[PDB]
């Protein structure tokens, strides 16, 4: 049987009419490390960027990557385990976090992706209706979000 | 006290297969579903490569008594074949006659 | 229908005996089903009319046997020679199809062979396909005794 | 093969033949249009590639 | 039964498929339910429509009552 | 099959 | 400008129906079946990897 | 369209137990377990078979959400002939009767309903269909009807409740087999009208993961329904 | 620490003895779960010690209500009394936690367990069903559920035959059939006696 | 236990009758048991208001059955005289239905009462 995935009902052509405040943001492993480098708080940095409440989310793969980083990145692991950060369970074998984030946004058009990886950003940009958040300069920056 | 225990010691979901040398009426009906796109100018369908199924049946619809007006056919209008009902429709034949002609001059 | 007449309610299944109607293994099955049934109770007024309906079933079945015997007596007096060969039921059906004994008498033996298979016969003739070879005589006792291609012969 | 048909059979056979010709014409017309748009599409990609 | 009759009422119930089905239908659907055997049958049509509405209410009282009485059917 | 068959002796 | 944007939006509403199915009030009248046909061998579900 | 005396061509669907009636319009069809009657006034199709008159029923997608799933192209439907199905939220025979048609005489359907008024008609239907076992009980407490249900191959949940995820998990833990099927109908408004439907659907998938249910596919039910989706998942008892 | 298991069937109460206690820390491991699914492995864990079928349909409905409400029926008190030794405290695995307090009140010497380890064992019993009874007469569990399901459901709804109108539908279908057949057969009597 | 259930209290009844009156002005109200029945069949009803003093009460008891099958909230008000007055008509009304419209001017008011009826049920 052939499969052609249905276009999400949350998309009006290139405009995602589902992502509205308060936002849900998927955190990538590099995002926390860069955030510590720039002295940017995760919760407040996002609130300043979007002028709204943001609900950060960490998947099992990203949590796994943080634990594998080592004692050098102890601060990142402590911030990632802040109770305000909710957790997302994973039901797939691989621990590769890049594919996990890409598959989640394909399934549901309700997440912002927070990452600085050039490879991952390029993939997300090809997916329509996915706002992309990054840390650049002194604070966060959001690309594909009309309400800003 | 008496006990015999001591004395006890000593298929529903299969459709009919069409018959080989099938009736001409069935073949003409199967062609209509295959080419249903051309019957009505105002009706258009999803693109589908419909092949004759290995097993199938010909059925007659039964309406509920509440649908006497909305979705019922008069007895005279009912015909044994889908094709025969289609010929009865006067609007359809007018379109076919007109449309059939234009293809002929172009040819 | 007889089970209804012997026992009207599932309650009676415990004491009522169905030996003359049913074998042993079947009669105990209904008894087990009676207590664990999903059905609802019915009144005597409802029971009385269902009994009346059941009494019509047995009477009609009784008369149906009588008519079967009556036809056999008729067939053995109006066409005794035919009954000896094909039988009473198939012999009577042959006469009815033609409409009269004389009308059947004037038919060739070939037509009598395929008398009850006109739909297959004329479909086959018009479509250049093999024709039937038993018709209505397929249910004769002698044809049943034959096997394979000998049935056609 | 040569056959002999009644009036009703002839009407049914004529009706089918009319339908198939209409279907054949309609199917080809859609094919030619989409084929043309492929040609127009290709001529634009050549600009994109170049 | 009191409103129209035992036999006519029984035919209407069977056409709906059950007394509960008959009660759930709207008055317009009840009228066309017996419009093939003329159970309820310009001034003639108005009585037919009027009787169909009352028949619909009578079915509701019967179906949704544990021990229906004939008091309301009589006044109806 | 209608294409296969041909009609003869028509009135 | 107001008239131009009005025609542009209604044009986009037509195109959205081609891109994806859109709710249009549901069933109106007797259920007459799927007018455009049913495709047996096509699935439109989003599959979790 | 599909008028009274019209003739149609009935052919099998990709899913077992489901049929397609072709014509000018296509209709989703299931074989009638109890011929000669309609449960909610649906159109029926009669076919002569060597001759016995077998009957069929029309499955209306606008009335049954499972039918809306089949229209939209669900890849896997664990409801199939000869399988035990636990149907939660069985208001009446509108959709259960069609599920009973698919499973067939060898299968069995456990219909669970809470309200008594819809329950009464569920009992009346269940008599016509021997393979339907009606359970008038609250699905939030599966312990109350544990005697009446054995293991089930698939669980179908149409309960429109905010806490439907908890109901699904409790019933699946008690009754669903290992590697069993789970099919959920999610209505965004019932769970959370404050947020968009997409946020709700992602949230429900998360709760299913927490309850050892692996989601396989998701499908939105437009144009038949608005803000509705069907999530199909497999129950991994050991873990995800 | 589970030694006896209580499973309730539509036909009756079944009590089992746990021969081998599956690993508790490794309960979630795949292999131990696979043991529950496999019939051959499952027999090694538990063995049926007693089964007390209900006397009839009425008793089954009465205990279904009691089991639904987490109460101990006289039949359940008897079967546990014959099975559970007086004994420090015998451990009984029960599916429902609400039933535990009622069992404790009747039997102070039994401590009920309904943890996930117990649920896994209860789940395995439901899976194999009649296969675990070693041929002992348990009827058929599918048909028993069907009758009990209707009984349990109709009891809560309080359905009564007085509401029944199917008699009316059958009577009408029979009446017009009688009129047709009265007319049909009567004409034949005219034909047959017409000759004479 | 009574056939008419749940019955709204004095505080809840006034808010229901308030929404009914606004819906009447906006042509978002269907009055009468028959018209309410049609809305349920078409699935265009937000919720159903019934009068508990209907004489007899049974002539509107099919609506709860249809509502619970369709998962539509329903509630009973003590008086049909009051319901008819709020409906805007000159005659008593036993049943009424609020028509679904996500583009209505009284959307927030409808969902407010809809929530409390759901809590009541
Ligand atoms: Zn992951």
User: Mind giving me the DSSP string for chain I?
Assistant: ---EEEEE-SSEEEEEEESSPPPSTTTTSHHHHHHHH-HHHHHHHEEEEEEEE-SSHHHHHHHHHHHHTT---HHHHHHHHHHS-----EEEE-S-STHHHHHHHH-TTEEEE-SHHHHHHHHHHHHHGGGGGTT-----HHHHHHHHHHHHHHHHHT--GGG--HHHHHHHHHHHHHHHHHHHHHHHHHHHHHH-
Tokens standing for residue H42: 């649906």
DSSP H or E segment with residue B85: helix B82-88
Residue-number span of the structural domain to which J109 is assigned: 1-121
In 10 A of CB D12, how many CB atoms?
20
* Eight-class DSSP state of J5: -
Angle between helices E6-16 and E43-63 (to 10 degrees): 80
Q: Classify strands J74-77 and H44-49 as parallel, antiparallel or unpaired.
A: unpaired
Angle at E23 between CA E17 and CA E25, to 5 degrees: 80
Q: Which chains does chain D touch, 3 or more C-beta pairs < 8 A?
A: B, F
> Residue A103 in contact with residue A16, Cβ under 8 Å?
no
> Residue J121 in contact with residue J73, Cβ under 8 Å?
yes
What kind of experiment solved this structure?
Answer: cryo-EM
A–G contact: 3+ Cβ pairs < 8 A: yes
Chain-centroid distance of CA I81 in Å reads 21
Nearest by Cα to I4 from I69, I34, I61, I48: I48
Cβ burial, residue C73 (10 Å; 0-12/13-18/19+): exposed
Tokens standing for residue A144: 């594909």
> Residue E55 in contact with residue E30, Cβ under 8 Å?
yes
The minimal CB distance from A6 to the residues G15, G20, G48 is found for G20
How many residues appear in chain B?
Answer: 107
Nearest by Cα to I120 from I1, I24, I3: I24
Angle at A10 between CA A92 and CA A112, to 5 degrees: 55
CA distance linking residue B4 with residue D35, whole number of Å: 93
Sign for the pseudo-dihedral over CA of B64, B69, B75, B77? negative
Q: Determine the distance in angstroms separating the CA of I6 from the nearest CA of chain H, rounded to an integer.
A: 12
> Residue E73 in contact with residue E61, Cβ under 8 Å?
yes
CA distance linking residue I90 with residue C134, whole number of Å: 78
In 10 A of CB C85, how many CB atoms?
12
DSSP H or E segment with residue J51: strand J45-51
Cβ burial, residue I119 (10 Å; 0-12/13-18/19+): middle
> Residue H139 in contact with residue H110, Cβ under 8 Å?
no
| CB crowding E18-47: b at 16 or more within 10 Å, else e | bbbbbbbbbbbbbbbbbbeeebbeeeeeee
Cβ burial, residue G27 (10 Å; 0-12/13-18/19+): middle
Chain-centroid distance of CA C142 in Å reads 19
Nearest by Cα to A10 from E31, H222, H205, B47: H222
The phi and psi torsions of I183 (rounded to 5 degrees) equal -65, -45
In 10 A of CB H198, how many CB atoms?
26
Resolution expressed in Å: 3.0
The answer for A13, left when phi > 0, alpha when psi is -120 to 50, beta otherwise, is left
Nearest by Cα to A117 from A131, A98, A94: A98
Per DSSP, the three-state class of J30 is: strand
Ranges of beta strands (E only) in chain G are 42-43, 46-47
In 10 A of CB C67, how many CB atoms?
9
Q: Classify strands J45-51 and J95-99 as parallel, antiparallel or unpaired.
A: antiparallel
Q: Tokens 């609130």 map to which residue?
A: A47
Q: Which chains does chain E touch, 3 or more C-beta pairs < 8 A?
A: B, H, I, J
CA distance linking residue I4 with residue J60, whole number of Å: 55
SS (H, E, C) E20-41: HHHHHCCHHHHHHHCCCCCCCC
**Mutant choice from B36, B46, B55 vs G, greatest count of G C-beta within 10 A:** B46
With an 8 Å Cβ cutoff, are B64 and H43 in contact?
Answer: yes
Give G46's contacts in chain H (Cβ within 8 Å).
217-219
CB < 8 Å & 24+ apart, contacts of A18-22: A18/A109, A18/A110, A18/H196, A18/H197, A18/H198, A18/H199, A19/A109, A19/A110, A19/A111, A19/A112, A19/A129, A19/A131, A19/A145, A20/A147, A20/H196, A21/A50, A21/A52, A21/A53, A21/A147, A22/A52, A22/A53, A22/A54, A22/A55
Per DSSP, the three-state class of G42 is: strand
With an 8 Å Cβ cutoff, are H7 and B39 in contact?
Answer: no
Task: Give the DSSP letter string of chain H.
Answer: ---TT-EEEEEE-SSTT-EEEESSSBEEEEE-SSTT--SSS--EEEEEE--EEEEEEE--TTT-HHHHHHHHT-S-----TT-EEEEES--SHHHHHHHHHHHTTTSEEEEEE--HHHHHHHHHHHHH-TTEEEEES-TT-GGGGSTT---EEEEEE----TTHHHHHHHHHHHHEEEEEEEEEEEEHHHH-SSS-HHHHHHHHHHHHHHTTEEEEEEEE-TTT-SSEEEEEEEE-SS--
Nearest by Cα to D19 from B34, B1, C13: B34
Q: Tell me the CA–centroid distance for residue A64 and ligand 1, in Å.
A: 9
Q: Does H124 touch chain E (CB under 8 A)?
A: yes
Nearest by Cα to C60 from A63, H193, I177, J84: I177
Q: Which chains does chain H touch, 3 or more C-beta pairs < 8 A?
A: A, B, E, G, I, J
* Chain H stretch 13-72, residues whose beta carbon is closer than 8 A to a beta carbon of chain G: 13-14, 20-21, 23, 25-28, 43, 58, 60, 62, 71-72
Give the chain H residue whose CA is nearest to the CA of G44.
Answer: H73
Give B35's contacts in chain F (Cβ within 8 Å).
none
Q: Tokens 């149906």 map to which residue?
A: C64
**Mutant choice from I42, I149, I156 vs H, greatest count of H C-beta within 10 A:** I149
How far lies F9's CA from each of C128, D6, D16, F6, H142, in Å?
19, 10, 21, 10, 78
Q: Does I125 touch chain H (CB under 8 A)?
A: no
> Residue A37 in contact with residue A106, Cβ under 8 Å?
no
* Chain D stretch 1-50, residues whose beta carbon is closer than 8 A to a beta carbon of chain F: 1-5, 10, 13, 16-17
CA distance linking residue I123 with residue H142, whole number of Å: 13
Q: Tell me the CA–centroid distance for residue H53 and ligand 1, in Å.
A: 54
The minimal CB distance from H25 to the residues G23, G35, G44 is found for G35
CA distance linking residue C135 with residue C115, whole number of Å: 6
β-partners of residue J108 are: none
β-partners of residue I15 are: I6, I50
With an 8 Å Cβ cutoff, are F7 and D10 in contact?
Answer: yes
Total structural domains within chain J? 1
* Chain C stretch 76-95, residues whose beta carbon is closer than 8 A to a beta carbon of chain I: none
Q: Tokens 């959709």 map to which residue?
A: H95
Angle at G11 between CA G6 and CA G14, to 5 degrees: 135
How far lies E47's CA from each of B30, E44, E54, E56, J117, in Å?
49, 5, 11, 14, 40
Q: Tell me the CA–centroid distance for residue A41 and ligand 1, in Å.
A: 24
The phi and psi torsions of G26 (rounded to 5 degrees) equal 90, -145
The answer for B18, left when phi > 0, alpha when psi is -120 to 50, beta otherwise, is beta
Nearest by Cα to H215 from A88, G42, I27: A88
* Eight-class DSSP state of C18: -
Chain-centroid distance of CA H116 in Å reads 20
| CB crowding H17-56: b at 16 or more within 10 Å, else e | bbbbbbbbbbbbbbbbbbeeebbbbbbbbbbeeeeeebbb
**What is the rounded end-to-end Cα distance, in angstroms, of chain F?**
22
How far lies I136's CA from each of B3, B103, C42, I133, in Å?
22, 79, 36, 5
The phi and psi torsions of C100 (rounded to 5 degrees) equal -165, 160
The minimal CB distance from F4 to the residues D1, D4, D5 is found for D1
Chain-centroid distance of CA I117 in Å reads 22
Tokens standing for residue I54: 């209900």
Q: Is the peptide bond before G25 cis (omega within 30 degrees of 0)?
A: no
Tokens standing for residue F8: 């003869």
* Eight-class DSSP state of C19: T
J–E contact: 3+ Cβ pairs < 8 A: yes
Tokens standing for residue H133: 């076992």
CB < 8 Å & 24+ apart, contacts of B3-7: none
Tokens standing for residue D11: 């009407």
Tokens standing for residue E44: 């003639």
In 10 A of CB C61, how many CB atoms?
11
* Eight-class DSSP state of A128: T
Give the chain J residue whose CA is nearest to the CA of E73.
Answer: J56
With an 8 Å Cβ cutoff, are E14 and I173 in contact?
Answer: yes
Rg (CA), chain A: 15
Angle at B88 between CA B87 and CA B93, to 5 degrees: 55
Nearest by Cα to A18 from A27, A31, A28, A7: A7
Give the chain H residue whose CA is nearest to the CA of I13.
Answer: H147
| CB crowding C119-148: b at 16 or more within 10 Å, else e | ebbeeeeeeeeeebebbbbeebeeeeeeee
In 10 A of CB I48, how many CB atoms?
18
Sign for the pseudo-dihedral over CA of B62, B65, B67, B69? positive
Q: Does G30 touch chain B (CB under 8 A)?
A: yes
Those residues whose C-beta lies under 8 Å from the C-beta of residue J80, and which sit 6 or more positions away, are: J51, J53, J54, J92, J93, J94
CA distance linking residue H160 with residue H142, whole number of Å: 17
CA distance linking residue E43 with residue A72, whole number of Å: 95
Q: Tokens 């169909």 map to which residue?
A: E52
Rg (CA), chain B: 28
Q: Classify strands G42-43 and J74-77 as parallel, antiparallel or unpaired.
A: unpaired
CA distance linking residue H12 with residue H111, whole number of Å: 26
Helices and strands in chain G: count of H runs, count of E runs: 1, 2
Give H221's contacts in chain A (Cβ within 8 Å).
none
The minimal CB distance from A10 to the residues H75, H198, H205 is found for H198
Those residues whose C-beta lies under 8 Å from the C-beta of residue E69, and which sit 6 or more positions away, are: none
Tokens standing for residue I149: 């399901």
How far lies A115's CA from each of A49, A90, A124, A131, G45, in Å?
15, 19, 10, 11, 28
> Residue B35 in contact with residue B50, Cβ under 8 Å?
no
How far lies H126's CA from each of A78, H65, H94, H135, I21, in Å?
58, 20, 12, 10, 42
CA distance linking residue A39 with residue A19, whole number of Å: 27
DSSP H or E segment with residue C46: helix C44-78
Tokens standing for residue I67: 């089991």
With an 8 Å Cβ cutoff, are B43 and G35 in contact?
Answer: yes
SS (H, E, C) C79-131: CHHHHHHCCHHHHHHHHHHHCCHHHHHCCCHHHHHCCCCHHHHHHHHHCCCCC
CA distance linking residue A52 with residue A44, whole number of Å: 10
CA distance linking residue H68 with residue H185, whole number of Å: 11
β-partners of residue H57 are: H30, H44
Q: Tell me the CA–centroid distance for residue A105 and ligand 1, in Å.
A: 12
Tokens standing for residue D44: 């634009």
Task: Give the DSSP letter string of chain E.
Answer: --SS-HHHHHHHHHHHTSHHHHHHS-HHHHHHHTTTTTS---HHHHHHHHHHHHHHHHHHHHHT-SS--SHHHHH-
CA distance linking residue H187 with residue H229, whole number of Å: 7
Q: What is the strand order of the sheet J95-99 is part of?
A: J29-31, J95-99, J45-51, J74-77
Q: Tokens 């049946």 map to which residue?
A: B57
Alpha helices by DSSP H, listed for J1-121, are 10-25, 33-42, 62-70, 80-87, 107-120
CA distance linking residue J91 with residue J87, whole number of Å: 9
β-partners of residue H176 are: H152
B–G contact: 3+ Cβ pairs < 8 A: yes
* Chain B stretch 81-100, residues whose beta carbon is closer than 8 A to a beta carbon of chain E: none
How many residues appear in chain E?
Answer: 76
Q: Classify strands B57-62 and A139-142 as parallel, antiparallel or unpaired.
A: unpaired
Q: What is the CATH number of the domain that holds J14?
A: 3.30.1330.30
């Amino acid at each position: 049987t052939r499969n052609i995935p249905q276009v999400s009902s949350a998309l009006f052509f290139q405009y995602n009419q589902a992502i509205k405040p308060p936002y849900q943001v998927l955190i990538d492993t590099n995002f926390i490390n860069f955030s510590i480098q720039k002295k940017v708080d995760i919760v407040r940095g996002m609130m300043d960027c979007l002028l709204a409440k943001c609900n950060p989310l960490i998947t099992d793969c990203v949590m796994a990557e943080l634990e594998k980083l080592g004692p050098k990145y102890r601060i990142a692991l402590k911030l990632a385990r802040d109770p305000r950060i909710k957790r997302l369970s994973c039901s797939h074998k691989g621990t590769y976090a890049d594919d996990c984030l890409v598959h989640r946004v394909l399934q549901h058009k309700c997440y912002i992706v927070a990452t600085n990886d050039a490879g991952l950003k390029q993939r997300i940009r090809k997916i329509p209706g996915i706002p992309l958040m990054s840390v650049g300069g002194h604070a966060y920056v959001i690309e594909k979000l009309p309400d800003v | 006290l008496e006990t015999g225990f001591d004395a006890l010691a000593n298929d529903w979901f299969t459709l009919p297969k069409p018959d080989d040398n099938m009736r001409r009426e069935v073949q003409r009906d199967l062609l209509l579903i295959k080419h249903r796109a051309a019957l009505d100018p105002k009706r258009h369908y999803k693109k589908q490569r419909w092949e004759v199924p290995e097993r199938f049946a010909i059925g007659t619809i039964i309406e509920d008594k509440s649908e006497f007006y909305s979705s019922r056919m008069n007895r005279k209008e009912r015909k044994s074949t889908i094709l025969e009902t289609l010929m009865g429709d006067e609007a359809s034949n007018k379109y076919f006659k007109r449309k059939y002609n234009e293809i002929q001059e172009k040819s | 229908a007889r089970i209804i007449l012997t026992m009207g309610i599932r309650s009676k299944a415990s004491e009522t005996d169905l030996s003359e109607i049913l074998p042993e293994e079947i009669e105990e099955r209904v008894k087990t089903a009676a207590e664990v049934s999903m059905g609802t109770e019915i009144t005597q007024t409802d029971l009385d009319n269902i009994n009346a309906l059941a009494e019509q079933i047995v009477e009609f079945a009784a008369y149906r046997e009588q008519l079967s015997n009556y036809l056999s007596a008729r067939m053995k007096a109006i066409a005794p020679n035919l009954t000896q060969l094909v039988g009473e039921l198939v012999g009577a059906r042959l006469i009815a199809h033609s409409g009269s004994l004389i009308s059947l008498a004037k038919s060739p033996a070939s037509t009598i062979q395929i008398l009850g298979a006109e739909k297959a016969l004329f479909r086959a003739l018009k479509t250049k396909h093999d024709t039937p070879k038993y018709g209505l005589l397929y249910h004769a006792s002698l044809v049943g005794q034959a096997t394979g291609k000998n049935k056609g012969k | 093969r040569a056959v002999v048909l009644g009036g009703d059979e002839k009407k049914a056979r004529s009706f089918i033949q009319k339908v198939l010709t209409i279907s054949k014409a309609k199917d080809s017309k859609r094919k030619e249009q989409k084929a043309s748009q492929r040609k127009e599409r290709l001529k634009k990609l050549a600009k994109m590639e170049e | 039964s009191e409103l129209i009759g035992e036999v006519i009422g029984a035919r209407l119930i069977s056409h709906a498929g059950s007394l509960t089905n008959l009660s759930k239908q709207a008055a317009s659907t009840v009228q066309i339910l017996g419009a093939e055997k003329a159970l309820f049958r310009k001034n003639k049509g108005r009585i037919s429509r009027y009787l169909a509405n009352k028949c619909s209410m009578a079915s509701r009282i019967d179906n949704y009552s544990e021990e229906p009485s004939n008091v309301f059917g009589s006044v109806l | 099959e209608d294409e296969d068959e041909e009609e003869v002796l028509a009135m | 400008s107001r008239v131009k944007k009005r025609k542009k939006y209604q044009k986009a509403q037509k195109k959205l129906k081609s891109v994806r199915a859109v709710y249009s009030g549901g069933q109106s009248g007797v259920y007459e079946g799927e007018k455009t046909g049913i495709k047996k061998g096509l699935t439109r579900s989003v599959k979790f990897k | 369209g599909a008028r009274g005396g019209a003739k149609v061509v009935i052919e099998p669907h990709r899913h077992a137990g489901v049929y397609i009636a072709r014509g000018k319009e296509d209709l989703l069809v299931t074989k009638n377990m109890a011929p000669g009657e309609s449960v909610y006034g649906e159109k029926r199709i009669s076919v002569e078979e060597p001759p016995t008159k077998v009957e069929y029923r029309v499955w209306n997608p606008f009335r049954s959400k499972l039918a809306a799933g089949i229209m939209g192209g669900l890849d896997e439907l664990f409801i199939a002939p000869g399988k035990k199905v636990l149907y939660l939220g069985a208001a009446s025979g509108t959709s259960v009767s069609h599920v009973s048609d698919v499973v067939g005489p060898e299968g069995v359907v456990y219909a669970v309903e809470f309200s008594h008024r819809p329950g009464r008609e569920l009992i009346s239907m269940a008599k016509k269909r021997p393979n339907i076992i009606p359970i008038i009980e609250d699905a939030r407490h599966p312990q109350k009807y544990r005697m009446l249900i054995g293991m089930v191959d698939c669980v179908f949940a149409d309960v429109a409740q905010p806490d439907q995820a908890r109901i699904i998990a409790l019933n699946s833990h008690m009754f669903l087999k290992d590697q069993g099927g789970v099919v959920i109908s999610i209505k965004a408004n019932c769970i959370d009208s404050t947020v968009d439907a997409e946020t709700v659907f992602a949230r429900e998938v998360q709760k299913l993961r927490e309850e050892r249910i692996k989601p396989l596919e998701q499908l939105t039910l437009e144009p038949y329904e608005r803000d509705h989706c069907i999530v199909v998942g497999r129950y991994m008892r050991s873990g995800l | 620490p589970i030694e006896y298991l209580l499973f309730e069937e539509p036909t009756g109460y079944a009590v089992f003895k746990v021969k081998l206690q599956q690993d508790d820390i490794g309960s979630r491991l795949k292999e131990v779960q696979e043991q529950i699914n496999d019939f051959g492995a499952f027999t090694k864990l538990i063995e049926l010690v007693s089964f007390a079928p209900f006397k009839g349909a009425a008793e089954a409905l009465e205990n279904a209500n009691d089991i639904s409400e987490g109460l101990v029926s006289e039949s359940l008190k008897a079967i546990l009394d014959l099975n559970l030794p007086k004994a420090k405290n015998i451990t009984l695995a029960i599916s429902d936690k609400n039933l535990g307090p009622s069992i404790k009140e009747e039997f102070p010497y039994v401590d009920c367990i309904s943890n996930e380890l117990a649920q896994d064992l209860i789940r395995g019993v439901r899976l194999h069903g009649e296969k675990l009874f070693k041929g002992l007469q348990s009827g058929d569990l599918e048909r028993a559920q069907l009758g009990l399901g209707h009984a349990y459901s109709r009891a809560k709804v309080k359905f009564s035959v007085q509401k029944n109108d199917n008699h009316i539908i059958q009577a009408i279908a029979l009446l017009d059939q009688l009129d047709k057949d009265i007319n049909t057969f009567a004409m034949r009597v005219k034909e047959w006696y017409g000759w004479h | 236990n009574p056939k008419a259930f749940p019955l709204a209290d004095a505080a809840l009844t006034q808010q229901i009758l308030d929404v009914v009156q606004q819906a009447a002005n906006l042509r978002q109200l269907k009055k009468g048991a028959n018209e309410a029945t049609k809305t349920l069949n078409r699935g265009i009803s937000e919720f159903i208001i019934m009068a508990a003093d209907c004489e007899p009460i049974e002539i509107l008891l099919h609506l709860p059955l249809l509502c619970e099958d369709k998962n539509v909230p329903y509630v009973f008000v003590p008086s049909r005289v009051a319901l008819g007055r709020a409906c805007g008509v000159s005659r008593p009304v036993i049943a009424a239905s609020i028509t679904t419209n996500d583009a209505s001017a009284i959307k927030t008011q409808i969902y407010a009462v809809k929530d409390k009826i759901e809590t009541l049920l």
